[PDB]
């Protein structure tokens with residue numbers, strides 16, 4: 001069929017029932033008016049941070065990535081691959097969407113290896129096999145993929161959701177939209193930046209405008225854009241009225257050009 | 259293809275790396291010497307209890323079922339559908355098994371509804387659609403199914419793993435083996451009971467020999483046995499040497515006759 005569209009979800013989205021309702025309303029409307037099959041990839045520092053907080057566990061993120069010790073991978077996996085993933089599956093069911101929950105290791109959709117011993121159980125995601133997901137898409141299911149992966153040696157890995165989404169986009173040859181709490185990438189004044197290139201990203205990074213998580217998000221988007229040969233959008237999930245146009249192609253945030 | 263074989267896992271199994279290794283060794287050996295496709299269903303009060311314990315959260319089980327308040331369903335879902343499920347997926351990968359993680363709601367494999375308001379988010383599992391799992395089995399994957407489900411209204415439900423396994427057995431017309439920490443059902447002296455009938459189960463229950471969780475396990479096994487028209491075994495996963503014969507049909511625990 002057509003190239004699928006991957007919609008990546010994350011941020012505080014999971015903390016808002018209203019936001020989730022409006023989002024799924026837009027997803028149903030899109031699905032029932034488009035032939036391009038959808039695939040959802042999600043993160044959830046939201047469900048994770050709140051949990052780590054309650055557990056008095058520190059949240060150290062080295063260069064945008066969460067240091068994930070061996071004694072914390074199981075609980076993080078529970079929050080991400082379990083709670084976040086199933087919460088989204090429940091919303092899909094509530095809206096009569098036939099969804100199937102998956103993590104990066106299912107059907108070896110996305111290959112993961114240990115990125116850096118200093119990060120612990122943090123995985124480096126690279127393209128895998130599209131066979132399983134393609135079969136699910138052809139059968140009419142909506143794959144909802146978490147960012148937890150597993151190495152060939154059987155070690156669970158926590159993968160940044162933006163990087164996981166980009167790896168899956170390459171695997172499926174899918175278009176990609178990264179939805180976040182903010183309207184794309186902001187400049188030094190907090191204003192939305194309409195278009196992004198590698199040269200500009202480098203500039204902004206050199207100037208300290210793009211920091212933390214956003215450095216990881218932009219680099220992931222740029223990688224996807226150059227791999228696919230198609231633009232990649234970073235936009236917000238916060239405003240109901242913008243969702244339909246967004247899912248249809250209207251630039252609502254930052255469009256990465258490669 | 260042939261009627262699949264569902265192997266249900268639970269208990270303290272997840273706390274033993276050695277036990278997990280020996281189990282998967284036996285699973286690989288079985289798979290490579292049998293045409294009957296395997297399906298794993300798992301519980302995990304193990305990963306859940308230890309977590310609830312550390313959280314100073316009480317574990318109240320009414321009539322063998324864990325009272326699951328709305329404020330605890332997310333964390334239980336994380337432990338069961340996330341941690342337990344992915345831990346098993348990691349072991350499968352370690353042994354080069356192409357597995358796919360699922361929960362009861364995927365492909366509506368097992369239908370779930372609220373069992374009793376007094377239990378909270380505890381689901382009543384009944385047969386669903388075998389289409390998704392049958393397709394995965396035909397494609398060569400090993401489904402690993404958690405006991406978390408979801409109602410049509412989008413509410414996550416915690417389902418007793420034995421009941422979930424029985425509901426799935428009916429859905430798939432699968433043979434069933436329930437693996438636990440003990441060698442089947444024990445009598446008043448703690449000795450293994452070789453065969454079980456509904457009449458005998460009633461007797462033992464009336465005599466207070468079969469209590470708690472075991473009442474739920476036996477009733478689930480008896481239901482499966484009468485639905486399938488085939489015997490159902492309850493046996494232990496603790497002894498390495500018994501696994502091969504067990505998976506092949508040798509009675510190692512309690513065989514439920516219907």
Ligand SMILES: Nc1ncnc2c1ncn2[C@@H]1O[C@H](COP(=O)(O)OP(=O)(O)NP(=O)(O)O)[C@@H](O)[C@H]1O
Nearest residue numbers: 010011043044045161180185186209210211213214
């Ligand atoms: N120049 C910048 N422009 C925009 N956002 C920035 C910038 N620098 C840093 N950020 C941060 O980038 C965050 C975006 O990345 P991130 O916090 O990981 O959200 P997410 O990827 O949407 N969620 P999730 O998948 O759950 O992690 C924003 O909310 C900002 O705090």
Ligand SMILES: Nc1ncnc2c1ncn2[C@@H]1O[C@H](COP(=O)(O)OP(=O)(O)NP(=O)(O)O)[C@@H](O)[C@H]1O
Nearest residue numbers: 268269301302303419438443444467468469471472
């Ligand atoms: N007459 C009995 N015979 C055998 N076991 C009994 C009996 N009465 C109670 N039990 C208990 O039944 C338990 C078996 O059920 P359960 O504790 O829920 O394990 P499980 O279903 O294997 N694990 P899981 O899926 O993770 O919940 C045993 O370990 C015993 O504590």
Ligand SMILES: CC(=O)N[C@@H](CCC(=O)O)C(=O)O
Nearest residue numbers: 043044045065066159160161
């Ligand atoms: C390694 C890493 O940073 N992981 C992310 C995965 C979830 C996400 O992107 O929201 C994390 O916060 O734990």
Ligand SMILES: CC(=O)N[C@@H](CCC(=O)O)C(=O)O
Nearest residue numbers: 301302303323324417418419
């Ligand atoms: C409702 C209910 O008892 N659920 C089970 C599910 C896991 C299992 O069987 O191990 C529970 O302990 O939370």
Ligand SMILES: [Mg+2]
Nearest residue numbers: 010043162213
């Ligand atoms: Mg992020």
Ligand SMILES: [Mg+2]
Nearest residue numbers: 268301420471
């Ligand atoms: Mg049990």
